[PDB]
Amino acid sequence: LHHAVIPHGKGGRSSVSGIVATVFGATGFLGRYLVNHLGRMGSQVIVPYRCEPYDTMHLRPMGDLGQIIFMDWNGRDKDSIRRAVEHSNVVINLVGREWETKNFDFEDVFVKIPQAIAQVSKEAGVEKFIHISHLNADIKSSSKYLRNKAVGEKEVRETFPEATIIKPADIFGREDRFLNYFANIRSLGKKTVKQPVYIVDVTKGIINAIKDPDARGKTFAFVGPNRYLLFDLVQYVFAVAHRPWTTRDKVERIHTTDRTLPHLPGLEDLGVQATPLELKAIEVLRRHRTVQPAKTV
Amino acid sequence: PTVKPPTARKFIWTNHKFNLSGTPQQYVPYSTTRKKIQEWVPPSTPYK
Amino acid sequence: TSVKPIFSRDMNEAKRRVRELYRAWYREVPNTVHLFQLDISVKQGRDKVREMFKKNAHVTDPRVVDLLVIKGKMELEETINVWKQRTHVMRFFHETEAPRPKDFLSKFYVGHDP
Amino acid sequence: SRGEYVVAKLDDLINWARRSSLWPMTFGLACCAVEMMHMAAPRYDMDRFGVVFRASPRQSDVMIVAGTLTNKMAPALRKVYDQMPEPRYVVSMGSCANGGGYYHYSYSVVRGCDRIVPVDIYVPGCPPTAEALLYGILQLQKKIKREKRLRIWYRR
Amino acid sequence: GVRTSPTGEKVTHTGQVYDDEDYRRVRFVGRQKEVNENFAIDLIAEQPVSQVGSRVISCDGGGGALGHPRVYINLDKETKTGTCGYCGLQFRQQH
Amino acid sequence: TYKYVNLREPSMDMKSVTDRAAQTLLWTELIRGLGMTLSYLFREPATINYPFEKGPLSPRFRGEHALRRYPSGEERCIACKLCEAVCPAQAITIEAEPRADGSRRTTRYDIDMTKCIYCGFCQEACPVDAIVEGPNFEFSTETHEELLYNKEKLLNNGDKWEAEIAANIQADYLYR
Amino acid sequence: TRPTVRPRNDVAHKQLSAFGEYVAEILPKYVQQVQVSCFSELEICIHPDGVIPVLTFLRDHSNAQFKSLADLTAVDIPTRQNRFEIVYNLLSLRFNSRIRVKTYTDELTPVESSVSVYKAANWYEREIWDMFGVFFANHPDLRRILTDYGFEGHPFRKDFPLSGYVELRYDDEVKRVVAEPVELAQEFRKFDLNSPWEAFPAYRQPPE
Amino acid sequence: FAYDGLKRQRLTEPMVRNEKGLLTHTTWEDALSRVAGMLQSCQGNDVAAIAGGLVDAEALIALKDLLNRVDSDTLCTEEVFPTAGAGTDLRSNYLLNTTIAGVEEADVVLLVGTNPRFEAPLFNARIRKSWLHNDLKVALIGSPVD
Numbered sequence A: 001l002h003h004a005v006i007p008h009g010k011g012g013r014s015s016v017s018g019i020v021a022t023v024f025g026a027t028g029f030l031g032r033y034l035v036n037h038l039g040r041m042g043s044q045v046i047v048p049y050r051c052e053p054y055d056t057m058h059l060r061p062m063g064d065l066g067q068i069i070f071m072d073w074n075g076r077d078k079d080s081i082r083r084a085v086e087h088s089n090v091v092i093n094l095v096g097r098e099w100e101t102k103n104f105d106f107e108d109v110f111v112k113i114p115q116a117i118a119q120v121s122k123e124a125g126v127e128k129f130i131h132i133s134h135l136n137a138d139i140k141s142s143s144k145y146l147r148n149k150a151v152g153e154k155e156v157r158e159t160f161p162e163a164t165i166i167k168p169a170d171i172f173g174r175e176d177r178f179l180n181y182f183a184n185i186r187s188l189g190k191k192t193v194k195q196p197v198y199i200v201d202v203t204k205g206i207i208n209a210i211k212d213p214d215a216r217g218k219t220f221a222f223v224g225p226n227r228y229l230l231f232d233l234v235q236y237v238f239a240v241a242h243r244p245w246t247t248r249d250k251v252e253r254i255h256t257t258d259r260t261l262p263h264l265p266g267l268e269d270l271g272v273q274a275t276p277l278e279l280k281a282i283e284v285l286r287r288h289r290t291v292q293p294a295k296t297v
Numbered sequence B: 001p002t003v004k005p006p007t008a009r010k011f012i013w014t015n016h017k018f019n020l021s022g023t024p025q026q027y028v029p030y031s032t033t034r035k036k037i038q039e040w041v042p043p044s045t046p047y048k
Numbered sequence C: 001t002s003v004k005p006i007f008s009r010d011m012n013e014a015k016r017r018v019r020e021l022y023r024a025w026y027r028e029v030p031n032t033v034h035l036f037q038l039d040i041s042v043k044q045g046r047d048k049v050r051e052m053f054k055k056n057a058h059v060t061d062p063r064v065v066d067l068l069v070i071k072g073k074m075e076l077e078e079t080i081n082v083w084k085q086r087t088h089v090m091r092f093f094h095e096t097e098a099p100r101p102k103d104f105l106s107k108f109y110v111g112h113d114p
Numbered sequence D: 001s002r003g004e005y006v007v008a009k010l011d012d013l014i015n016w017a018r019r020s021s022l023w024p025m026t027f028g029l030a031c032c033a034v035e036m037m038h039m040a041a042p043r044y045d046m047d048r049f050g051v052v053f054r055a056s057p058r059q060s061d062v063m064i065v066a067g068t069l070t071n072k073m074a075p076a077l078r079k080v081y082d083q084m085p086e087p088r089y090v091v092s093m094g095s096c097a098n099g100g101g102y103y104h105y106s107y108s109v110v111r112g113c114d115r116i117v118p119v120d121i122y123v124p125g126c127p128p129t130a131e132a133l134l135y136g137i138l139q140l141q142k143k144i145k146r147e148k149r150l151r152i153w154y155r156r
Numbered sequence E: 001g002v003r004t005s006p007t008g009e010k011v012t013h014t015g016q017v018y019d020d021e022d023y024r025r026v027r028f029v030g031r032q033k034e035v036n037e038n039f040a041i042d043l044i045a046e047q048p049v050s051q052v053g054s055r056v057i058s059c060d061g062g063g064g065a066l067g068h069p070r071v072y073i074n075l076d077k078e079t080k081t082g083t084c085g086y087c088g089l090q091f092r093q094q095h
Numbered sequence F: 001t002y003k004y005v006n007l008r009e010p011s012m013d014m015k016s017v018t019d020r021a022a023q024t025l026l027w028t029e030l031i032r033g034l035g036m037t038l039s040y041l042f043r044e045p046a047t048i049n050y051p052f053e054k055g056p057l058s059p060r061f062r063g064e065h066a067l068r069r070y071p072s073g074e075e076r077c078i079a080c081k082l083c084e085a086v087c088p089a090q091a092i093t094i095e096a097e098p099r100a101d102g103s104r105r106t107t108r109y110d111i112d113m114t115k116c117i118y119c120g121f122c123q124e125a126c127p128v129d130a131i132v133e134g135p136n137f138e139f140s141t142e143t144h145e146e147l148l149y150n151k152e153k154l155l156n157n158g159d160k161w162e163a164e165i166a167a168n169i170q171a172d173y174l175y176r
Numbered sequence G: 001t002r003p004t005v006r007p008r009n010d011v012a013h014k015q016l017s018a019f020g021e022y023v024a025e026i027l028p029k030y031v032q033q034v035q036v037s038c039f040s041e042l043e044i045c046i047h048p049d050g051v052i053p054v055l056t057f058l059r060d061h062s063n064a065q066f067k068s069l070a071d072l073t074a075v076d077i078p079t080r081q082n083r084f085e086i087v088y089n090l091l092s093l094r095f096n097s098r099i100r101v102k103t104y105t106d107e108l109t110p111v112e113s114s115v116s117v118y119k120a121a122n123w124y125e126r127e128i129w130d131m132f133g134v135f136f137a138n139h140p141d142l143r144r145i146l147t148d149y150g151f152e153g154h155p156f157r158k159d160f161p162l163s164g165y166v167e168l169r170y171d172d173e174v175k176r177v178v179a180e181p182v183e184l185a186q187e188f189r190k191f192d193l194n195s196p197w198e199a200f201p202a203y204r205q206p207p208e
Numbered sequence H: 001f002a003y004d005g006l007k008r009q010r011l012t013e014p015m016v017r018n019e020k021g022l023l024t025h026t027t028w029e030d031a032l033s034r035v036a037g038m039l040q041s042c043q044g045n046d047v048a049a050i051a052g053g054l055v056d057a058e059a060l061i062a063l064k065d066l067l068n069r070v071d072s073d074t075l076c077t078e079e080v081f082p083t084a085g086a087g088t089d090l091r092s093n094y095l096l097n098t099t100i101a102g103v104e105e106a107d108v109v110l111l112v113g114t115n116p117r118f119e120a121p122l123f124n125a126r127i128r129k130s131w132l133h134n135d136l137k138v139a140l141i142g143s144p145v146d
């Protein structure tokens, strides 16, 4: 282990954690809190960004001087991926779109780009790789999202055999598109059962998966502590928010139940206690204001 | 400098560069010292 | 050993002032959680008040606990009048700080601090 | 292509209007406020660049952090920053706003305003002169001139 | 006289270059390592040794009060030249 | 040795009373203010055309730092650390060793330009005129760590601005 | 010793020594020392129970009339058991003169507030609460004046470190400016500058 | 001048033997576990210790308590002192009992089997100061060293 990557300090902002992290997709929602929790340890966070540099400004106070290296990359340029990962000791993937675009479909975002990142990270000597799938990923799933994400998970597993693949159920938080989706829909109630996971629990799970050497080659299912039906969940969202852009793929995924995978470990086997919805939903939905808790199963 | 030229030197930049900040020619800081503590290298031969 | 007091003549008047300051904090906590719109419960803030009062419970000097009551009244005055922001109230909850190693072995693993 | 030409010309238009009409909200913290008041004085005259003098913090386009940021005022700085409409920019003026400065090792000073807000232009000096602050404002304008919001929107 | 590591990184006049397996080369990715290519150790070697007929020479680096504090150098060793401690200009007694 | 500002008892004859009442009813001092503002409307303004026109500076001006060289290529810094003992901000970090020919030279010469108060105690404490605070003031960066200068950046500022720095020192050194 | 040496003012030295004797003999209940510096500044070191009777004297007495409180100061000297040294600087505009009234306390003994004599003291001794921790009894509004609102400790105490114990940064997880234990990317470098040779033989203390 | 060996050849990370029989770097958990698994399988004379020349009394009594939990008394030093007779029971037969300062009070010093110029150079400096100022008579039994 090299002398510059030995940890030092008391784990604060000016400390050294020995984590040289390349977070693909740090400009989004999971990457926000992930770069926050990495940089507050004193980790060398490499942020490959695709967007305008203005849209990366919030990542800049998240660490000490020189501890966030921004650089350009393309999903169809393996040279830029190698230019981003050739010094990192961990590579986290967080590339995702809820909607397919003119230049990237779900096959590009969930299959081609994660396999490219994992292949280049294998042939660059990166120790640790973390992939973020979805809990309901299935080949025979109704939505194209979960089909291509199951395909990309299989490809990441077969091209990086030690890839820590993580299954969040439905991540809620401030900049989420789950509770902010329900508070701004003003779809319906069915027999769909969900257990949504909190974003800080997911971030602590990812960083404890970095820190646990036994999490290599594993597959985790980051689920919340309380399973809810869809209907009383949506009624609880409209009860907290003081209320009386979509596609059919999101309609299929909201009416897709969060499956139970007891053979996979979860948040507790990384040392993270799951934060329930009712302690954070007021914090999420206070912005939407111009409460009896939901029924669990 | 046409009337009173500056005194020439062999180390003065013949090509003046403008502010390079924001370009790939910008300044990146680093520690200009070498490594202080030297680590022990274990022997590459077996011990039996 | 004959010293000039601050307010209290012995420990009984001192504990009386501690107790009235505790009453004032206990009454104030729901107002503080409302108007700072804190994301903690009222019970969580009241547990923090009980923690901040039990932290100084080892003191037997009347002048020292008189100064603790005075500084607690100052903190309460900065709380009731909105002089603190939400950030100053939530600095009692060390929420961005990672949990410190407690036993010998984890402190051995992380570094050199005893 | 054709749409690439359209988003190029529209980026040129909106970047022209955003760099040629910067409205600053200046935090008059410390001695750097005096030199910002000289950058508004007749010799340097920010107003001839379209850079108005003292816009209100809810219609301003750029926050000039001019002076020392202490621990007692850092939440007020972050509050004013969060209340700015986007696109918002931050010019850090002087050594105390940049990195703590002459009060860097103090108990009551935020070691640079970049621990609090994302900073675009770091203007160095104690204080940097009104000409140097005007240099930093024109460098901010050049930074806005090369923004590619619609080109990246078209390529996403 | 700048040289180059097997990583392609330029070595400074100190001798500083990062290791290949050091992560801190990622700060120069997409940017440049600013080195100064005028090495003073080579530039003072280019200066000729001043043959003087005295036994003790005085050096102030030229320019009078624009050089260094004025020092006096002994030239009684004939194997070694008399090197100024400030400017590195080395002197020799000609006899 | 003192004077009374605003201790004028006004006249009460009908002349001065009617003068003050005409000033009240006909707004004499308001037209005096409009006249002064109209007078500055027709003056040539004091605005210089930056960046094309520059504000006037003196050769004493204290801007960007630069490590200098002797007129042979040899650098002037003999690693004596007076500039970091005198530095009021502790912006200067110096580490030294004898180099390959035995000269007392630095390996680390850092200046944090965001700690620096630009007061020039380093150039006046320097016994050999190595560190100077040159005339560049237009060196704003887009990133905080670009204002954290090492020895390479400072020697490059010396090589970049020596043709100006030497002339400024030549113009000023008999005051020093 | 004409050009480079400060000229001594013997007239003001004699006048301030005489007025120091005057104050010491009018108020022997509290005056502990009276001294005059070589640059002619009078210090009246008193007992802390006589903060109000001395200061009301100098403010009101017809031979004193120290109507102005210029400055009020504490000095932390930890080697004394009464570590804090409360310093009053007074200006008589009538007699064109200045006096210094010095007293002492530790952390736990209160000093009586001098707002009943100089209302100017209302903030100054309040600053002495903020920076040093000296409590002032019967003060109108005693609270902090300069430190941040949740600030623990009194900063100008000499056992308090230069940088504090905490530092702030914005944290986007909790969307809040937060406090954390202080870590410095570069430590403050401590310079041991004192020469081991005696500088001033007039100020030599006798050995053990 | 030996403080620069204090920055060369240093052990900075725990090392364990890999599958090829070579020392490779590892964490503290792995190294302490691979030592403690063997320490739990020992008892009696199965485990022993050698104390080197530069070990403080804290680590000495630490490793003594650790091996006494295994019921092992076999804890040794490199430098051989004879255990015959009183041994290390009385402190007086393994100390410089007079003192380093007591050389100034002696009149005859007999040095036996030692070259104290290089074994204890400031003890020899104190013998030389007593030789110079107090007319100390020194005799040596051993090789005629300087």
Ligand SMILES: CCCCCCCCCCCCCCCCCC(=O)OC[C@H](COP(=O)(O)OCCN)OC(=O)CCCCCCCCCCCCCCCCC
Pocket: D005, D006, D009, D010, D012, D013, D016, D145
């Ligand atoms: C299909 C393809 C087309 C798609 C739609 C676009 C239609 C045309 C839109 C207007 C023109 C777009 C191009 C904008 C300018 C691009 C070039 C540029 O930036 O030139 C810079 C130049 C000044 O240079 P500068 O960088 O400011 O230098 C500082 C001083 N040395 O700048 C100048 O000299 C001035 C630039 C002025 C820009 C045009 C004038 C303003 C816009 C008018 C039309 C829109 C508004 C209509 C009315 C609104 C209500 C009043």
Ligand SMILES: NC(=O)C1=CN([C@@H]2O[C@H](COP(=O)(O)OP(=O)(O)OC[C@H]3O[C@@H](n4cnc5c(N)ncnc54)[C@H](OP(=O)(O)O)[C@@H]3O)[C@@H](O)[C@H]2O)C=CC1
Pocket: A024, A025, A026, A027, A028, A029, A030, A031, A049, A050, A051, A074, A075, A094, A095, A096, A097, A098, A104, A109, A132, A133, A134, A135, A168, A169, A170, A171, A172, A176, A177, A178, D156
């Ligand atoms: N509720 C949730 O958030 C959950 C998310 N997940 C999965 O976790 C991952 C991250 O989630 P999340 O942060 O919420 O999603 P976001 O859409 O908010 O973030 C995706 C990130 O990837 C980047 N990105 C997207 N498409 C591309 C592309 N074609 N090429 C390059 N970069 C691209 C985005 O950058 P830019 O801004 O430049 O477009 C952004 O930084 C996704 O894979 C998602 O499926 C799983 C379970 C729950």
Ligand code: SF4
Pocket: D030, D031, D032, D033, D066, D067, D068, D093, D094, D095, D096, D097, D101, D102, D125, D126, D127, D128
């Ligand atoms: S950087 Fe210096 S001159 Fe500028 S405001 Fe700060 S203290 Fe004043």
Ligand code: SF4
Pocket: F076, F077, F078, F079, F080, F081, F082, F083, F084, F094, F122, F125, F126, F127, F128, F129, F130, F131
């Ligand atoms: S720059 Fe000057 S003062 Fe500083 S160490 Fe070098 S020679 Fe000494």
Ligand code: SF4
Pocket: F083, F086, F087, F088, F089, F090, F091, F092, F111, F115, F116, F117, F118, F119, F120, F121, F122, F123, F133
């Ligand atoms: S100008 Fe002053 S603060 Fe700046 S490096 Fe020189 S001595 Fe230090």
Ligand SMILES: [Zn+2]
Pocket: E059, E060, E061, E068, E084, E085, E086, E087, E088, E089
């Ligand atoms: Zn010389």
